[PDB]
Amino acid sequence: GADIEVTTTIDEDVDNTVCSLREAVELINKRNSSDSTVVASVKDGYHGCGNKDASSNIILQRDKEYTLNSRITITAPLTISTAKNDSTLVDTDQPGSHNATIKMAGTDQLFKIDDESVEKASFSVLLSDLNLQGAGANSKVLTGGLILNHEKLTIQNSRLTGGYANQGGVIYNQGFASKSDRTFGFVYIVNSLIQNNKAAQGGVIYSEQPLFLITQSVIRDNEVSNTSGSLFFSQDSFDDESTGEYVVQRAIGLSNSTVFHNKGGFITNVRDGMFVNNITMIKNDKGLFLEAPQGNASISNSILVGNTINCQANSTDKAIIQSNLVTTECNRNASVKVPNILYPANQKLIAGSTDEGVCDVASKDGLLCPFNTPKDSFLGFFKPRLLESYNTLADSLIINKGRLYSVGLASCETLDQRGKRRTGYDELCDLGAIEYIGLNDIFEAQKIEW
Amino acid sequence: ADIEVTTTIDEDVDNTVCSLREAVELINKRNSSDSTVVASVKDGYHGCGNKDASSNIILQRDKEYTLNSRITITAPLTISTAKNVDTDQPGSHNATIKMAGTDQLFKIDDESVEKASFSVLLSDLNLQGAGANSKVLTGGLILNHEKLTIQNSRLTGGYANQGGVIYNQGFASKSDRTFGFVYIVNSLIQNNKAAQGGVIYSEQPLFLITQSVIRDNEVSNTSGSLFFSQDSFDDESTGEYVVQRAIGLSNSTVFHNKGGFITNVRDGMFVNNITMIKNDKGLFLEAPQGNASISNSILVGNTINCQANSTDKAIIQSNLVTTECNRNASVKVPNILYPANQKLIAGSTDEGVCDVASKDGLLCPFNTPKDSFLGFFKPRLLSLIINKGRLYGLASCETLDQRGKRRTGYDELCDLGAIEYIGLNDIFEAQKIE
Ligand SMILES: [Mg+2]
Ligand SMILES: [Mg+2]
Ligand SMILES: [Mg+2]
């Protein structure tokens, strides 16, 4: 049926003619109630949010800001997204430039997602094309600065900012995973910008077990104040003998993501069952903390240099690190068939002197362009450089150094951070979050000449 | 008169017998705002007569009432066992509510956004959950969103993912008066299990357990707690709560529990005059403001007695402690150090007959007198706990002990733990000199 379009930007639950975001969620919660009188109470709507065969899709208007004075509790599957324009019209606007904003005006988290139904467990929630802004420095949140989650949470095409808490700056993810514990929270984030989030532990995500997957995203300017902690922190390991299947499945970890300028502790603590593939992790305080003692973790096809601490291992760890651009710090447990690419001492990582800015095509050194967001892209990245000092592609430390065979646990991703397909010509791919595709640097070098 | 349940089976069928489910439905429908639903129960509901029937549901002594799925309570009511003057052991004739399926026993919630919470009383009952056959996720016995009071009862067999006995929903504020609050008095909590919140999983610390026994429970997450609160109160309210002693644990015996901690002490909570011995893990301290008080308790004999996070400032005064629970910042009301070589219990086991002719045991083994519903560890006259508290001030003794006996003056002194030593039974039974 019809989607629920929120018709006021204020935070309210008052029976009147307008529909608020809180009321739109409360409508979907009540239609999902196990009490027949509650379901019948919202047969024709709830306090301004019309119903009568309405969908579970909540629509927010483009370029509008919706304020919350306290948390919204979600007890039923639903989606919240920004209204989409006509696709048959010329849309040259930059992606994500018209996202609706959900803004915390108080000191609370934005959402709590949980369920207390007799069976009928683990529903899904989709947050799409939204600007989620937390309380920031005014936050009083203990766990989950933006969201406390116990369900199947997917966030896409979104900005995640201002999530401050003691544990889990963006998300605190509850729940343990086993054959008997089937009601656990899981976090899936794709094509999103994660910035300005802080926590004492789990600066971005604090999860009780490795139950998150971050792909095609930018992670910048976040902090975990415990310098031994992590931005994506797993409190406990899995109950053994199951991690050998999780890693080959590549269901938990980080992929196709650019991670730079983060502060304090590590990006993530790599436990058994987790994987890291095709990420660009540079210019951070700390990179990867390795504690996969069974050897059921995989780190591949990534750029893991230019951080104050690139890798650091716990007392027992056997994480398989292969086909990465690394220094000696991260050259651990590498196989002879899939070795890492060692980072030479005399190697300049970024062209020019700025970590972020316009790239100088007429620069003879520098593996990567500075960070930049093209006008046709939501997220920015460090584009690999095809230098003139490369007689062949074998001279590059990044380009065509991976293998694109779900084969061998060292295969590149099918896509890159931008969502573009990695062609896999000659079964080869580029290290890091970005596959080299367009050759405008070569075109421009001919025009600048003479 | 009260609503008398006249069958032990579970049903909602229009016939000649009144079931517990139909007795609750009668009260729910009478409280409805729909005048047609109210009229449908004008002359009773499906066998439960309703002409002079109140909101008190009565179950028969020594009878077991089976539920095959949960009952949803949406209206104020009480459930209790019929009375009888009476010299039997208290609680020996309780009616039993037993889950025969895989569900929780009760969901207590009208699901109203605006309406303030209503009151439900469960008195003199044996509540037994599905146990190993449970499929419950939240609230092995009760999913609560209202003002739930449980007294004189047994709470056993509650198995769930969150909240072995009770899952308590709600946040407390002047603009949100729909929060649930659990008040448990003179009850036995035993053989319950959860991944988090082995007994109570609560969103905020909205519970007070007093004069009760907590034994043989488990929270499988070794970082979790039996009485677990997921969130904290507002910083501005914790100062009042700790002084008023609104939420926490008092006058209770806690032993033989497994897995994680007994409770995670957040700001606003208090612990006073408990005997917390022989557990896997004791208290987890999590009060960064310093607005939490732990006093007059016995906090030794557990594998882990206390453990705090980096920022905890919980006030720990006048307790029997080891290194983990001791604080050098308590100079005026210090704790008492428990020696290692001393035997905690003057007996061969943790439960059974007390060894009267001894000078090495601080407490008698756990024993239930025949004139009492709950048992306890009675102190012995030898010293480390007798007259070590002050009646009198966050460190004041409770006015009563677990048994409801008054802790007398005794030069403004009281005994640490859940039991006040009153009778000189130790000294009289030393007549064995032959
Ligand atoms: Mg309205
Ligand atoms: Mg009947
Ligand atoms: Mg209510």
Side-chain angles (χ1 to χ4, degrees), chain A, chain B residues 1-409 411-434:
Chain A
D3 299 327
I4 311 171
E5 307 178 50
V6 176
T7 54
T8 179
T9 55
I10 74 174
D11 190 6
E12 75 166 22
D13 187 341
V14 176
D15 195 7
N16 52 17
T17 67
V18 295
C19 173
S20 75
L21 172 60
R22 179 177 306 278
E23 291 171 346
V25 174
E26 195 65 38
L27 171 62
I28 301 171
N29 290 344
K30 275 167 156 47
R31 301 182 329 200
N32 188 239
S33 174
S34 63
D35 190 306
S36 304
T37 74
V38 169
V39 179
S41 62
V42 291
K43 62 176 76 196
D44 299 319
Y46 180 73
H47 293 178
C49 300
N51 183 32
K52 278 214 166 188
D53 311 275
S55 78
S56 297
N57 297 316
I58 305 178
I59 303 293
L60 304 183
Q61 292 299 305
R62 306 170 70 83
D63 301 313
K64 295 290 191 57
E65 171 168 309
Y66 299 84
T67 67
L68 297 177
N69 296 329
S70 61
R71 77 172 57 83
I72 290 181
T73 299
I74 297 171
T75 67
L78 56 83
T79 74
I80 308 179
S81 68
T82 300
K84 283 180 277 292
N85 263 327
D86 191 345
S87 42
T88 68
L89 299 183
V90 175
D91 188 15
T92 54
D93 293 352
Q94 184 170 23
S97 58
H98 297 295
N99 283 5
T101 299
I102 302 183
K103 178 69 166 295
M104 170 56 57
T107 69
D108 203 0
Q109 60 193 176
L110 294 179
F111 296 105
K112 169 181 175 301
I113 311 181
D114 216 321
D115 184 15
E116 291 80 24
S117 67
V118 173
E119 305 159 346
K120 301 176 172 58
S122 272
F123 59 88
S124 303
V125 167
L126 175 59
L127 309 181
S128 185
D129 301 81
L130 299 173
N131 293 336
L132 267 49
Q133 188 160 8
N138 286 31
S139 173
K140 294 296 155 61
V141 180
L142 263 176
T143 63
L146 297 194
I147 302 175
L148 168 72
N149 175 67
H150 198 67
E151 309 299 327
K152 271 57 186 171
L153 178 62
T154 299
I155 302 179
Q156 63 185 12
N157 316 330
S158 292
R159 294 179 174 86
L160 301 178
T161 72
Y164 288 24
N166 180 251
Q167 298 180 324
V170 177
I171 298 166
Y172 190 105
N173 189 72
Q174 314 171 291
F176 288 86
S178 68
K179 71 160 63 181
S180 52
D181 302 329
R182 301 172 293 174
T183 88
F184 54 90
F186 202 98
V187 173
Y188 181 49
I189 298 179
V190 46
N191 194 35
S192 296
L193 172 65
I194 302 172
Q195 64 179 4
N196 187 33
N197 306 289
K198 293 172 190 158
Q201 181 63 278
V204 178
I205 295 183
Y206 185 113
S207 188
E208 291 175 332
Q209 277 187 330
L211 297 174
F212 53 86
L213 176 58
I214 315 298
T215 200
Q216 301 180 25
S217 298
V218 174
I219 302 152
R220 62 177 300 172
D221 306 313
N222 304 285
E223 183 173 63
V224 52
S225 52
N226 186 345
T227 60
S228 297
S230 291
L231 298 179
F232 298 90
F233 176 75
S234 294
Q235 175 193 277
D236 280 300
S237 61
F238 289 112
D239 284 330
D240 206 324
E241 291 187 342
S242 63
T243 56
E245 299 178 274
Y246 295 164
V247 52
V248 316
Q249 175 163 48
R250 292 179 165 172
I252 300 149
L254 314 168
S255 74
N256 277 334
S257 293
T258 300
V259 182
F260 72 112
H261 290 179
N262 295 287
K263 299 172 285 181
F266 296 85
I267 303 308
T268 186
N269 57 321
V270 180
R271 302 191 182 275
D272 283 312
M274 300 178 58
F275 86 107
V276 178
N277 195 31
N278 282 111
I279 73 161
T280 294
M281 191 194 69
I282 59 180
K283 314 309 290 285
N284 301 285
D285 276 343
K286 293 186 182 178
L288 304 176
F289 188 70
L290 312 176
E291 48 182 352
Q294 300 171 294
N296 289 336
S298 183
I299 306 163
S300 54
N301 299 310
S302 301
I303 307 180
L304 310 172
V305 299
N307 312 283
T308 305
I309 296 174
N310 294 312
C311 296
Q312 181 175 324
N314 212 339
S315 72
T316 55
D317 166 69
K318 288 167 57 186
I320 301 181
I321 304 182
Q322 47 191 14
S323 187
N324 303 273
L325 177 62
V326 300
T327 59
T328 305
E329 216 172 40
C330 295
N331 193 29
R332 294 169 48 95
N333 299 310
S335 60
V336 296
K337 258 182 256 194
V338 198
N340 289 306
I341 293 88
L342 269 303
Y343 189 66
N346 66 357
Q347 192 50 65
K348 195 188 215 311
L349 184 57
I350 305 175
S353 66
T354 63
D355 284 0
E356 181 171 359
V358 190
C359 192
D360 184 16
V361 183
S363 177
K364 311 308 126 180
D365 62 337
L367 303 183
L368 302 170
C369 277
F371 186 92
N372 178 258
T373 307
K375 285 72 50 210
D376 67 328
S377 179
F378 171 46
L379 299 178
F381 49 83
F382 296 93
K383 181 178 165 63
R385 299 187 67 231
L386 183 47
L387 299 194
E388 298 169 347
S389 67
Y390 301 161
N391 294 80
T392 68
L393 295 189
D395 297 338
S396 174
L397 297 165
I398 292 171
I399 300 179
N400 270 17
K401 287 303 153 305
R403 280 117 290 185
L404 208 168
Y405 298 110
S406 177
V407 176
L409 248 182
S411 184
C412 275
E413 295 294 311
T414 311
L415 313 168
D416 73 348
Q417 179 185 304
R418 303 170 290 175
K420 299 177 179 297
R421 322 196 67 80
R422 296 178 190 254
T423 78
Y425 175 89
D426 212 8
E427 311 198 343
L428 297 180
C429 48
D430 310 334
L431 307 182
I434 295 300
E435 181 86 0
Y436 187 96
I437 296 178
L439 276 68
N440 182 64
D441 292 356
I442 283 82
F443 306 153
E444 186 82 317
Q446 175 177 345
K447 307 172 184 177
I448 287 193
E449 200 178 1
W450 319 117
Chain B
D2 302 313
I3 298 177
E4 278 198 10
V5 177
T6 60
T7 182
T8 52
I9 55 91
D10 190 14
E11 75 172 20
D12 184 358
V13 170
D14 193 11
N15 57 22
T16 67
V17 293
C18 171
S19 70
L20 175 60
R21 175 180 305 275
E22 293 164 349
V24 174
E25 283 298 321
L26 173 62
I27 298 175
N28 292 345
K29 295 176 175 297
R30 279 162 25 180
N31 187 250
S32 171
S33 55
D34 186 4
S35 62
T36 67
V37 155
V38 176
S40 66
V41 296
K42 156 66 145 35
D43 303 299
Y45 180 72
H46 288 181
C48 303
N50 186 73
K51 179 174 183 175
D52 208 63
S54 57
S55 291
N56 302 316
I57 303 175
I58 295 293
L59 305 179
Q60 296 302 321
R61 298 154 68 85
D62 305 312
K63 284 193 190 292
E64 169 173 318
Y65 298 82
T66 63
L67 299 176
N68 295 315
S69 62
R70 71 180 183 178
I71 295 175
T72 301
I73 304 177
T74 62
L77 55 83
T78 78
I79 310 180
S80 61
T81 311
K83 291 295 185 293
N84 62 72
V85 49
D86 174 52
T87 66
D88 291 330
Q89 180 168 24
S92 63
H93 296 298
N94 283 6
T96 305
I97 302 181
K98 162 79 99 200
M99 168 58 50
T102 62
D103 202 358
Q104 57 200 175
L105 296 176
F106 294 107
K107 164 191 171 186
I108 312 179
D109 188 13
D110 58 357
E111 300 186 38
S112 180
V113 179
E114 305 88 355
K115 201 180 308 173
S117 296
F118 61 83
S119 306
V120 172
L121 172 65
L122 306 180
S123 190
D124 308 85
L125 298 171
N126 298 331
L127 304 188
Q128 298 172 1
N133 294 348
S134 172
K135 286 201 182 71
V136 184
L137 315 170
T138 58
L141 298 195
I142 296 172
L143 171 58
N144 181 51
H145 211 310
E146 315 291 343
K147 297 182 298 177
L148 170 64
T149 295
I150 301 173
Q151 64 180 21
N152 315 328
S153 295
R154 290 182 178 85
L155 309 173
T156 67
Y159 282 42
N161 183 244
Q162 293 168 308
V165 178
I166 293 165
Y167 188 105
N168 189 68
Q169 313 169 276
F171 292 79
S173 65
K174 62 173 172 178
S175 62
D176 192 325
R177 295 147 60 190
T178 75
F179 63 93
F181 188 102
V182 179
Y183 183 45
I184 298 175
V185 182
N186 190 31
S187 296
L188 170 65
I189 304 180
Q190 187 178 25
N191 292 320
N192 305 283
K193 174 176 133 292
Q196 176 63 277
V199 176
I200 292 184
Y201 185 108
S202 191
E203 294 162 5
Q204 279 184 328
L206 292 168
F207 55 85
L208 176 58
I209 285 83
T210 192
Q211 302 179 212
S212 297
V213 173
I214 299 117
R215 62 177 299 178
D216 306 308
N217 306 281
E218 171 183 346
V219 50
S220 64
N221 179 14
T222 57
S223 295
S225 296
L226 296 180
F227 300 93
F228 174 77
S229 56
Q230 203 279 325
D231 222 337
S232 65
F233 296 111
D234 191 311
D235 285 5
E236 317 300 311
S237 66
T238 56
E240 274 180 297
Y241 288 164
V242 59
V243 175
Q244 294 144 349
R245 292 178 169 176
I247 61 270
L249 314 167
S250 63
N251 278 334
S252 297
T253 302
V254 178
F255 70 107
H256 289 184
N257 296 290
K258 302 151 281 179
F261 300 89
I262 301 309
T263 185
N264 55 315
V265 183
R266 301 190 182 277
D267 279 307
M269 297 172 63
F270 86 106
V271 179
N272 200 26
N273 283 109
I274 70 164
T275 296
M276 184 190 76
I277 66 173
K278 300 315 217 72
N279 301 277
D280 281 355
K281 298 189 180 176
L283 303 175
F284 182 76
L285 311 182
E286 208 173 3
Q289 288 179 279
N291 295 339
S293 185
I294 301 153
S295 57
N296 303 310
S297 296
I298 304 182
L299 312 169
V300 298
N302 317 283
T303 308
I304 296 177
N305 291 313
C306 293
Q307 178 182 331
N309 62 4
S310 58
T311 59
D312 167 78
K313 296 301 213 195
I315 300 176
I316 303 183
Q317 294 171 312
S318 185
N319 301 280
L320 183 66
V321 305
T322 58
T323 312
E324 289 167 327
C325 298
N326 195 15
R327 258 59 179 171
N328 193 69
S330 309
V331 315
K332 284 169 167 51
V333 197
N335 302 288
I336 296 89
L337 277 188
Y338 169 73
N341 60 330
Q342 274 231 11
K343 236 60 178 179
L344 182 61
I345 283 149
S348 57
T349 80
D350 291 351
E351 192 173 9
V353 60
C354 192
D355 177 40
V356 186
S358 63
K359 270 198 169 63
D360 58 325
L362 279 162
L363 301 159
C364 280
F366 188 89
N367 179 81
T368 305
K370 300 298 146 124
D371 75 329
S372 177
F373 168 46
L374 301 181
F376 48 86
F377 296 93
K378 184 181 182 182
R380 304 182 73 258
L381 201 288
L382 284 184
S383 180
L384 283 184
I385 75 186
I386 304 297
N387 287 335
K388 283 307 207 302
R390 311 208 101 273
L391 215 60
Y392 198 8
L394 297 183
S396 322
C397 306
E398 296 289 303
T399 62
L400 309 168
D401 75 337
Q402 180 187 298
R403 306 170 295 175
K405 303 276 181 294
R406 264 198 61 94
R407 300 181 189 257
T408 74
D411 285 3
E412 311 253 324
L413 307 168
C414 92
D415 308 331
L416 314 179
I419 293 303
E420 183 79 3
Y421 176 84
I422 322 183
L424 266 51
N425 308 99
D426 266 325
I427 313 307
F428 293 162
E429 218 166 341
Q431 102 284 20
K432 42 78 191 176
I433 300 183
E434 299 163 12

